[PDB]
């Protein structure tokens, strides 16, 4: 282990043609002890989905913090935040406390209702826009994911082919990740609706 | 303060066939944030269908390699020109790592070849000694990248049968030497893209009973 | 403290707390609680470093009690747990960090459902039917899957909890010298005498 | 990186090595270390390059106020601002700065301000890391109340030895001449001064 | 455990169609003080190889006797051996590799960065790196030390890959060596103007040029530049 | 990463590669290393990607605020001084390395600024990981006084050598040309040294090749009365 | 690392996991943490792999040599101790060790000795080694009986691995069983933890926090 | 951790030793043996650093038993106790220390009395009739001497011992799981089980 | 503590300051650093006084055994001995040694051996901590093949400058002139030297 990611967790975001997906494992760990099988990494505010990897206490704290920040916006402008705009909001929350900083790697996923265009982003510890629209992965299996994703990646798969491609990438990676191995939930996100599908997979 | 150890980089990949075995590796050598060489093989032929790659910090990997190469010659003089088997070679190499574990080597060694039944076999090492027979191993810095993809496409794990709701696995499919050569390439392509110590070239040795082949593919310098 | 457990059954929540209070090489007292009521149907056990434990328990106690009076209506266990998580996660970025880890059991009287929430020191709320911190969780989590069923009576949960005490005792150097077993039900919070 | 300033009868001429090194990497090879803080008052910088720049700009904020309200500053007046700053920022900053200037009534005055910050009136001074290689040649070869040609030749030659004996010293030898004629820039290039 | 005391800096080299060019600045640097000047880096070993050494001058001299003794040894136990079983770069290169590796493993290394450059009996260009660590690699362009980082990317334009050696002539290579020296004089504080440059050929032999100077030294843009960035 | 600047007569060019590495793994293959301070000031980032990104934004808002306040064109000169101050305050606890250049009425300027608050002027600069590899190309091939043409050719050459010898410098070259009294020309992916290699099989398969356990709809919108 | 062994009436059940984990990257999911010393004696590989693979091979060498000299089997007590002596010399050289030396012999009956890096010989009935040793105790003890059928004994030994493999981070692979007689160990195969997990969920009624 | 007790009464030496053998953060086995015979009338309890205990015991066993065969008669307790002290004195000047404390309780057959020695982990031998090491001697040097009278028997010394075990159980945070008590008299060495 | 040697047409003159300093207290202000190791070869010592003293003893011993067994030695032979003791023992002992002797078949010669041991032929050498300050003085006022008096004077001046800018350089300036006519020792009091 490392001090910024003792409690693990993995999130993977891809782009398809006018669709995104995002998926995560559901294992929480604390050192070598696997604690809970149900505990989601990904949370959402309106129509933008966010996974937050890292030291587990800060995932929970920013889940709450972002909800407070998003909802202040929504009520005031009378309209949903968009996943282009939402990028720079993560970047400022993370940078406010550069000294003593949040230990997370959040990954956005989402599709605009003003372009119909998939937007994914990654951020580090004190935050950055990593504005690739290749595919964006974070977590303890960061190394593992960048290769598995790359191999499979063909741009502009149909949504239901995209579900095959991200679920497979995630499952292989997880078996070989020490601090995640249990459960999975995959979000297949479209403009119209958002379908959530839990996998069935091995436990360790 | 002198420090013995370093890092000279690389990624290597052995895959075990049904009747063949392959051991490969990118041709990049690095020091810090330079590129030392853009064409130097990591994978060496040592004879009796045994190809040896000792990837990592080279000072440790080249010394190990010279040790094993002496082993084959005294195997010929005293044991009268017999086939040094890949399983038995694995023991012999273990003792060479272990001959100084007080001063431990830092290379990930993979040997690849046939057994005495003619079935592809890859046996893979830890720097301080131990080995075990694998089906697939990635050595080196981009090993983490390459590996989950290997289980997907050669071991067929995490994959299922259509029209069952994914409750019956996709079964095993025997391989070809061509099939693996294509798949190998893909691994080192993905790595060029998403890891920084992989590029320049690729050297694939193919150890069959039709001799030992060399095949070269360029990779990018990105 | 030196043993802390939580098992949640059909209509109750069961929490076990260490009697022993180990301070240096001497056990200064062999029969002290390490649990305090938050509310008449929400019970928080605590364990961790000495001195942190005692002032923290009382401070949290004052706050949940103050809310209960304000609204003249008691907060749901779900609420309570998120309050206790928030204090820990703030402390980890503050001057004085705690090492107080808590399990908060509650018989939710609005969803009519028993709930156990494990909360660690760093500040992680997880809903889980099991729970334990220290090196007590590292024995009894494994054990719990087999002998647990999808539900059982509170009597069968009591015996199940006694089995985890027996596992710990054998294999862990730490003394705790028996346990206080407190049950959290729909009709209050009670003590059952148990070896 | 060796810097000097050397008085003579009609004035003071500042000297500086235009090489800036951060490790074995020369960060830039044509960045001069001559910084104007006033018309007749100029400063040489050696030591930690970041630290010295930050001190330097604040002395000018004061001396801007100084010109406007209180009449022109003297060579002495500016050198005091340096001493004050270096001293209060003992552990945050080491600045080796040579302050020199021309007054009319007093001629050229040279003050070295140490790392620790003090003030020391001297007829000739050398500071930095490149300055510990040219001491013995500075003492012997100097004379008071020189003529202008001679003073340039003294500064050029001392700084030429610095380059042989230190690696942080190099580039081109910069000079800023302060006289009643004005402010004059002077330069030489290595092709010339290694034949010395 | 050793710390270097006086060290040499940088060696630059590259292949051409009829041999190899090896060159390096002449300097013994004790840290801030450039103490010793004209300190020959290039030791010719026989007349078909030049061996270049940067790093610790202490281990330089030590290697200098061991190479001279390598020829003296070749003469030994044979009736002829200077054209009969003629000396090769390959022998030196591995001799050096074994010794530096053994000494590093005794935890008191030989502290150098070495370029062996010569032409073989076969005439095939030989250009390979060896060091205290024990690293070995062969490349079309090589450089050690600071030059590794800085000057080598310039030499990598001229020859990219190993199948591009015959497209460089002796003139092209040398012109580029001078350009690499120009870069190193400028932007290395532990480089010196002075440099020696050995050209090894297979049809001509050793020409060894001593004490060349960098020419076309540009500094006329320096007058124009003023301030630290802002001139009030 | 690699960043260069080449001063020329009629302006200044700033080029930098698109790849961003955070550890030995590549964060992004394509992502901008030319951040916009003001319409006529641009700069590229090196070091830790987060520190450079934040700083540029922080200073950028202030120089757009300044333009409105002084009711005149944004100076490069304003920007550096303010930025330098900003950098000083952390005492080198912020890990930003930048090359800032621009055109303003004082003219073209090309500056280097370090994490410490050391500040430099040259007529050719670089900073980053791959700065030593580009620096070699500039000193040799540059001469004083250039046209647009020669400057753009020399800038892309330096990054290109950057990619081939530097590990953290990769992918494509993005170039921005700021000439005095003309529009900045943002030429995205001016140069590719090595295009993509494709994968040799199709990896798209039917569904049920990945196992499902439950299928659900999660909310994202408010229902009507239906 | 989850290794556990327990002696019973029918022999000695040796159960190990088949996952090796370097740190936050998993090294192999196919390994064997049973060393076959000779046909009668098994060792276990936990702590350092390099030290347990090599020295227990040496043990196997001594077992053969001792047997050639005497024309009689090497005893479980002798073998264990010789190896305890051997690692002791090598204490503090960076040697890690924690093998359980298991055997059934016709003059001692079934015996398990724990052999440690610190030069320990401890007679046990039940042992466990690993960082995952904590979790292995949990299942094993509470469902342990000296009188137990061999089949159900193998089964207990699958159960003791699954809960430990689940809740540990460094354990998975497969469930690698052996049963040891006076005729020596006969392998009882490699069963993927994946497939086995699900089955036990339904039939025991265990694993109620896992939804799939 | 790892209690060993000695008390000398006027017809026996009663030595006792722990059955907790703790390797890790986990007691590796519940019930064990930890005191072994040098000779038929000399018995040596041991504890100290982990793993050093098994090696050291066996080594001393071999020296006494060797010498006993050479003399053709059993060596005196004096001679055994000074032998043990030597090995540790030699070890503390060497590069491998052995940090193991013992008690030697024999019965002398030439003089007609029990002799109890205490041999420290430093390697210091001093004769004391209430010996102990570790965190046992912290509670028991005082307690054994309380009811101690000059005239004693095996039975009076045993009552007094059992009492010690219970004191330790109360105030130490270490589960010893009970003790084995071996009595040494002129009629051999025998185990008698104790609480 | 500074030591140096300057070649001339007739020989070589070795110059030293005679202060022995442990820390920043003076043990003895007259104990010289020029010590005789052969009939026509003398050596200079800097670094730790102890480490250099023993090293000389070994060299001296070798060279006397060389004079009986294999005829009298040279400066070239004399240098190399110190160097092997310094090169092997390059962490155990810290020793900067200047080896200067006179031959009739090569004249006066100067070899300097640095701290880690390396062989260097130079026409003059300078070592110590005071040597650093006077480095550019020596470069400029050294000439090859010069008059005997200008040599006396040049060494006299350079060491006098070391005394001026280094606090462990002082004592008296003592000198050993090696010629074919033997040995002439010379001494110079601060009252003579320092005024100059």
Swiss-Prot record, chain A:
Crosslink feature (Glycyl lysine isopeptide (Lys-Gly) (interchain with G-Cter in ubiquitin)) location: 69
Top-level division of the source organism's lineage: Eukaryota
GO BP of this protein: proteasomal ubiquitin-independent protein catabolic process; proteasome-mediated ubiquitin-dependent protein catabolic process
Residues carrying Phosphoserine: 30
PROSITE patterns named in the record: PROTEASOME_BETA_1, PROTEASOME_BETA_2
GO (cellular component) term, any one: nucleus
Principal location: cytoplasm
GO molecular function, one term: endopeptidase activator activity
CDD domains: proteasome_beta_type_3
UniProt cross-references to Pfam families, sorted A to Z: Proteasome
UniProt keyword annotations, A-Z: Cytoplasm, Isopeptide bond, Nucleus, Phosphoprotein, Proteasome, Ubl conjugation
Keyword RNA-binding: no
Location of this chain's protein in the cell: Cytoplasm; Nucleus
Oligomeric and partner information: The 26S proteasome consists of a 20S proteasome core and two 19S regulatory subunits. The 20S proteasome core is composed of 28 subunits that are arranged in four stacked rings, resulting in a barrel-shaped structure. The two end rings are each formed by seven alpha subunits, and the two central rings are each formed by seven beta subunits. The catalytic chamber with the active sites is on the inside of the barrel.
Family membership noted in the UniProt record: Belongs to the peptidase T1B family.
PANTHER family with a match to the protein in the record: METALLOPROTEASE TLDD, PROTEASOME SUBUNIT BETA TYPE-3
Record protein name field: Proteasome subunit beta type-3
Native species: Saccharomyces cerevisiae (strain ATCC 204508 / S288c) (Baker's yeast)
Originating gene: PUP3
Swiss-Prot record, chains D, I:
Pfam families xrefs: Proteasome (PF00227)
CDD domains in UniProt: proteasome_beta_type_6
Gene3D superfamilies: Glutamine Phosphoribosylpyrophosphate, subunit 1, domain 1
This protein's GO CC annotations: cytosol; nucleus; proteasome complex; proteasome core complex, beta-subunit complex; proteasome storage granule
Catalytic residue list: 1
Entry keyword Lipid metabolism: no
Gene Ontology MF, one: endopeptidase activity
Top EC category: hydrolase
Catalyzed reactions per annotation: Cleavage of peptide bonds with very broad specificity
Family to which the UniProt record says this protein belongs: Belongs to the peptidase T1B family.
Note from the entry: The side chain of Thr-1 acts as a nucleophile, and the N-terminal amino group acts as a proton acceptor.
Functional note: The proteasome degrades poly-ubiquitinated proteins in the cytoplasm and in the nucleus. It is essential for the regulated turnover of proteins and for the removal of misfolded proteins. The proteasome is a multicatalytic proteinase complex that is characterized by its ability to cleave peptides with Arg, Phe, Tyr, Leu, and Glu adjacent to the leaving group at neutral or slightly basic pH. It has an ATP-dependent proteolytic activity. PRE3 and PRE4 are necessary for the peptidyl-glutamyl-peptide-hydrolyzing activity. This subunit is necessary for the peptidylglutamyl-peptide hydrolyzing activity.
Name under which the protein is recorded: Proteasome subunit beta type-1
Source species: Saccharomyces cerevisiae (strain ATCC 204508 / S288c)
Swiss-Prot record, chain F:
Substrates-to-products reaction catalysed: Cleavage of peptide bonds with very broad specificity
Disulfide-bonded cysteines: none
Any one biological process term the GO annotation gives: proteasomal ubiquitin-independent protein catabolic process
Transmembrane segments: none
Keywords attached to this entry: Cytoplasm, Hydrolase, Nucleus, Protease, Proteasome, Threonine protease, Zymogen
Active site: 1 (nucleophile)
An MF annotation (GO) of this entry: endopeptidase activity
Gene Ontology CC annotation, any one: proteasome complex
Its job: The proteasome degrades poly-ubiquitinated proteins in the cytoplasm and in the nucleus. It is essential for the regulated turnover of proteins and for the removal of misfolded proteins. The proteasome is a multicatalytic proteinase complex that is characterized by its ability to cleave peptides with Arg, Phe, Tyr, Leu, and Glu adjacent to the leaving group at neutral or slightly basic pH. It has an ATP-dependent proteolytic activity.
Other known facts: The side chain of Thr-1 acts as a nucleophile, and the N-terminal amino group acts as a proton acceptor.
Family, as annotated: Belongs to the peptidase T1B family.
Name of this chain's protein: Proteasome subunit beta type-2
Naturally occurring in which organism (per UniProt): Saccharomyces cerevisiae (strain ATCC 204508 / S288c)
Annotated gene: PUP1
UniProtKB/Swiss-Prot annotation, chain G:
Subcellular compartments: Cytoplasm; Nucleus
The keyword Nucleotide-binding appears for this protein: no
Reaction(s) catalysed (UniProt annotation): Cleavage of peptide bonds with very broad specificity
Active-site residue numbers: 1 (nucleophile)
Sorted UniProt keywords: Cytoplasm, Hydrolase, Nucleus, Protease, Proteasome, Threonine protease, Zymogen
Keyword Cytoplasm: yes
Signal peptide bounds: none
One GO term (biological process): proteasome-mediated ubiquitin-dependent protein catabolic process
Effect after changing residue 51 to N: In DOA3-1; decrease in activity
EC id: 3.4.25.1
Residues at which bortezomib binds: 49
Single GO molecular function: endopeptidase activity
A GO cellular component annotation in the UniProt record: proteasome complex
Family: Belongs to the peptidase T1B family.
Summary of the function given for this chain in its UniProt record: The proteasome degrades poly-ubiquitinated proteins in the cytoplasm and in the nucleus. It is essential for the regulated turnover of proteins and for the removal of misfolded proteins. The proteasome is a multicatalytic proteinase complex that is characterized by its ability to cleave peptides with Arg, Phe, Tyr, Leu, and Glu adjacent to the leaving group at neutral or slightly basic pH. It has an ATP-dependent proteolytic activity. This unit is responsible of the chymotrypsin-like activity of the proteasome and is one of the principal target of the proteasome inhibitor bortezomib. This subunit is necessary for chymotryptic activity and degradation of ubiquitinated proteins.
Other comments on record: The side chain of Thr-1 acts as a nucleophile, and the N-terminal amino group acts as a proton acceptor. Present with 8530 molecules/cell in log phase SD medium.
Protein's UniProt name: Proteasome subunit beta type-5
């Amino acid at each position: 282990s490392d001090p910024s990611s003792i409690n693990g967790g993995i999130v993977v975001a891809m782009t398809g043609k006018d669709c995104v997906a995002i998926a995560c494992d559901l294992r929480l760990g604390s050192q070598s002890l696997g604690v809970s099988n149900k505990f989601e990494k990904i949370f959402h505010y309106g129509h933008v989905f966010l996974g937050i990897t890292g030291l587990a206490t800060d995932v929970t704290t920013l889940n709450e913090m972002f909800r407070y920040k998003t909802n202040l916006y929504k009520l005031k402008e009378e309209r949903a935040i968009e996943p282009e705009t939402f990028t720079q909001l993560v970047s400022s929350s993370l940078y406010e406390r550069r000294f003593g900083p949040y230990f997370v790697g959040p990954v956005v996923a989402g599709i605009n209702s003003k372009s119909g265009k998939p937007f994914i982003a990654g951020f580090d510890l004190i935050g950055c826009i990593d504005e690739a629209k290749d595919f964006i992965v974070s977590g303890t299996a960061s190394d593992q994911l960048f290769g598995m994703c790359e191999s499979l990646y063909e741009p502009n798969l149909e949504p239901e082919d995209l579900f095959e491609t991200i679920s497979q990438a995630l499952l292989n990676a997880a078996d070989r990740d020490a601090l995640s191995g249990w459960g999975a939930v995959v979000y297949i996100i479209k403009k119209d609706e958002v379908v959530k599908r839990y996998l069935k997979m091995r436990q360790d | 303060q002198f420090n013995p150890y370093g890092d000279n980089g690389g990624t290597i990949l052995g895959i075990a066939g049904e009747d063949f075995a392959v051991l490969a590796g990118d041709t990049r050598n690095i020091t810090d944030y330079s590129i030392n060489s853009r064409y130097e093989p990591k994978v060496f032929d040592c004879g009796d269908n045994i190809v040896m790659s000792a990837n990592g910090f080279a000072a440790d990997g080249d010394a190990l390699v010279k040790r094993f190469k002496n082993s084959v010659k005294w195997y010929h003089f005293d044991h009268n020109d017999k086939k040094l088997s890949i399983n038995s070679a694995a023991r012999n190499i273990q003792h060479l790592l272990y001959g100084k574990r007080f001063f431990p080597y830092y290379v990930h060694t993979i040997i690849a070849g046939l057994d005495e039944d003619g079935k592809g076999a890859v046996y893979s090492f830890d720097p301080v000694g131990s080995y075990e027979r694998e089906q697939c191993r990635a050595g080196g810095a981009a090993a983490s990248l390459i590996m989950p993809f290997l289980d997907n496409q050669v071991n067929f794990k995490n994959q299922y049968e259509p029209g069952t709701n994914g409750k019956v696995k996709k079964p095993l499919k025997y391989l070809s030497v061509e099939e693996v050569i294509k798949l190998v390439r893909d691994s080192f392509t993905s790595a060029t893209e998403r890891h920084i110590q992989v590029g320049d070239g690729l050297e694939i040795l193919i150890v069959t009973k039709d001799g030992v082949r060399k095949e070269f593919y360029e990779l990018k310098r990105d | 403290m030196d043993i802390i457990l939580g098992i949640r059954v059909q209509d109750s929540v069961i929490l076990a707390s260490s009697k022993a209070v180990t301070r240096g090489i001497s056990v200064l007292k062999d029969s002290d609680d390490k649990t305090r009521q938050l509310s008449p149907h929400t019970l928080m056990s605590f364990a961790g470093e000495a001195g942190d434990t005692v002032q923290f328990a009382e401070y949290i106690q004052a706050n949940i009690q103050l809310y209960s009076i304000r609204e003249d209506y008691e907060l749901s266990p779900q609420a309570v747990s998120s309050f206790v998580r928030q204090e820990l996660a703030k402390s980890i970025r503050s001057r004085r960090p705690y090492q107080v880890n808590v399990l908060i059991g509650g018989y939710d009287k609005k969803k009519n459902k028993p709930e156990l929430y494990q909360i660690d020191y760093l500040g992680t709320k997880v809903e889980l039917p099991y729970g334990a911190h220290g090196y007590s969780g590292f024995y009894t989590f494994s054990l719990l899957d087999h002998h647990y069923r999808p539900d059982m009576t509170t009597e069968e949960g009591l015996d199940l909890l006694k089995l985890c005490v027996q596992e710990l005792e054998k294999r862990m150097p730490m003394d705790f010298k028996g346990v206080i077993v407190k049950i959290v039900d729909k009709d209050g919070i009670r003590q059952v005498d148990d070896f | 990186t060796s810097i000097m300033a050397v008085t003579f009868k009609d004035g003071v001429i500042l000297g500086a090595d235009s090489r800036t090194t951060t490790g074995a990497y020369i960060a830039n090879r044509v960045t001069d270390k001559l910084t104007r803080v006033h018309d007749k008052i100029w400063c040489c910088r050696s030591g930690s390059a970041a630290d010295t720049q930050a001190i330097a700009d604040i002395v000018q904020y004061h001396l801007e106020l100084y010109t406007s309200q209180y009449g022109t500053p003297s060579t002495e007046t500016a050198a005091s601002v340096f001493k004050e700053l270096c001293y209060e920022n003992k552990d945050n900053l080491t600045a080796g700065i040579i302050v020199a200037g021309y007054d009319d009534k007093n001629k050229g005055e040279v003050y070295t301000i140490p790392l620790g910050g003090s003030v020391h009136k001297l007829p000739y001074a050398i500071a930095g890391s490149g300055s510990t290689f040219i001491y013995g040649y500075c003492d012997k070869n100097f004379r008071e109340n020189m003529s202008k040609e001679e003073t340039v030749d003294f500064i050029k030659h001392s700084l030429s030895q610095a380059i042989k004996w230190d690696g942080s010293s190099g580039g081109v030898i910069r000079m800023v001449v302060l006289t009643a004629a004005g402010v004059e820039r002077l330069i030489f290039y290595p092709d010339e001064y290694e034949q010395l | 455990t050793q710390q270097p005391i006086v060290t040499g800096t940088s060696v630059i080299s590259m292949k051409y169609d009829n041999g190899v060019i090896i060159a390096a600045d002449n300097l013994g640097s004790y840290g801030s003080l450039l103490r010793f000047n004209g300190v020959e880096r290039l030791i010719p070993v026989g007349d078909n190889t030049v061996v270049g050494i940067s790093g610790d001058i202490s281990d330089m001299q030590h290697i200098e006797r061991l190479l001279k003794d390598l020829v003296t040894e070749n003469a030994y136990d044979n009736p002829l051996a200077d054209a009969e079983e003629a000396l090769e770069p390959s022998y030196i290169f591995e001799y050096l590799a074994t010794v530096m590796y053994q000494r590093r493993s005794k935890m008191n290394p030989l502290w150098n960065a070495i370029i062996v450059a010569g032409v073989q009996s076969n005439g095939d260009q030989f250009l390979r790196y060896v060091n205290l660590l024990g690293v070995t690699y062969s490349s079309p362009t090589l450089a050690t030390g600071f030059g590794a980082h800085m000057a080598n990317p310039l030499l990598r334009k001229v020859v990219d890959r190993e199948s591009d050696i015959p497209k460089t002539t002796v003139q092209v290579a040398e012109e580029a060596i001078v350009n690499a020296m120009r870069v190193l004089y400028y932007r290395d504080a532990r480089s010196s103007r002075n440099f020696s440059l050995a050209i090894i050929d297979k049809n001509t032999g050793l020409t060894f040029k001593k004490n060349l100077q960098v020419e076309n030294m540009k500094w006329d843009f320096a007058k124009d530049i003023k301030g630290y960035g802002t001139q009030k | 990463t690699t960043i260069v600047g080449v001063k020329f007569n009629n302006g200044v060019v700033i080029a930098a590669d698109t790849r961003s590495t955070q550890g030995p793994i590549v964060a992004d293959k394509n992502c901008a290393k030319l951040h916009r301070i003001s319409p006529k000031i641009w700069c590229a980032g090196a070091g830790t990607a987060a520190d450079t990104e934040a700083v540029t934004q922080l200073i950028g808002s202030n120089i757009e605020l300044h333009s409105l306040y002084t009711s005149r064109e944004p100076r490069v000169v304003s920007a550096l001084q303010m930025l330098k101050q900003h950098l000083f305050k952390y005492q080198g606890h912020i890990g930003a390395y930048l090359i800032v250049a621009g055109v303003d009425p004082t003219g073209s300027h090309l500056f280097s600024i370090h994490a410490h608050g050391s500040t430099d002027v040259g007529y050719y600069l670089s900073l980053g990981s791959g700065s030593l590899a580009a620096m070699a190309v500039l000193e040799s091939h540059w001469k004083q006084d250039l046209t647009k043409e020669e400057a753009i050719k020399l800038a892309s050459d330096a990054i290109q050598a950057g990619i081939w010898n530097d590990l953290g410098s990769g992918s494509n070259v993005d170039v921005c040309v700021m000439e005095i009294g003309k529009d900045a020309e943002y030429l995205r992916n001016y140069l590719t040294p090595n295009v993509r290699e494709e994968k040799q099989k199709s990896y798209k398969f039917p569904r049920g090749t990945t196992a499902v356990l439950k299928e659900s709809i999660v909310n994202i919108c408010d229902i009507q009365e239906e | 690392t989850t290794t556990l062994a327990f002696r019973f009436q029918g022999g000695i059940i040796v159960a190990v996991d088949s996952r090796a984990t370097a740190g936050n990257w998993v090294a192999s999911q196919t390994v064997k943490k049973v060393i076959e010393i000779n046909p009668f004696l098994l060792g276990t590989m936990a702590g350092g792999a390099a030290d347990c693979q090599f020295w227990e091979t040496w043990l196997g060498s001594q077992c053969r040599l001792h047997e050639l000299r005497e024309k009689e089997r090497i005893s479980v007590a002798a073998a264990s101790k010789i190896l305890s002596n051997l690692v002791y010399q090598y204490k503090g050289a960076g040697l890690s060790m924690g093998t359980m030396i298991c055997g059934y012999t016709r003059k001692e009956g079934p015996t398990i000795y724990y052999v440690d890096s610190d030069g320990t010989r401890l007679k046990g009935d039940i042992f466990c080694v690993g960082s995952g040793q904590t979790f292995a105790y949990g299942v094993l003890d509470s469902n342990y009986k000296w009188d137990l059928s061999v089949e159900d004994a193998l089964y207990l030994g699958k159960r003791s691995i699954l809960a430990a493999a689940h809740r540990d981070a460094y354990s998975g692979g497969s469930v690698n069983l052996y049963h040891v007689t006076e005729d020596g160990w006969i392998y009882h195969g490699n069963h993927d933890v994946g497939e086995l997990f699900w089955k036990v969920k339904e039939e025991e009624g265990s694993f109620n926090n896992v939804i799939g």
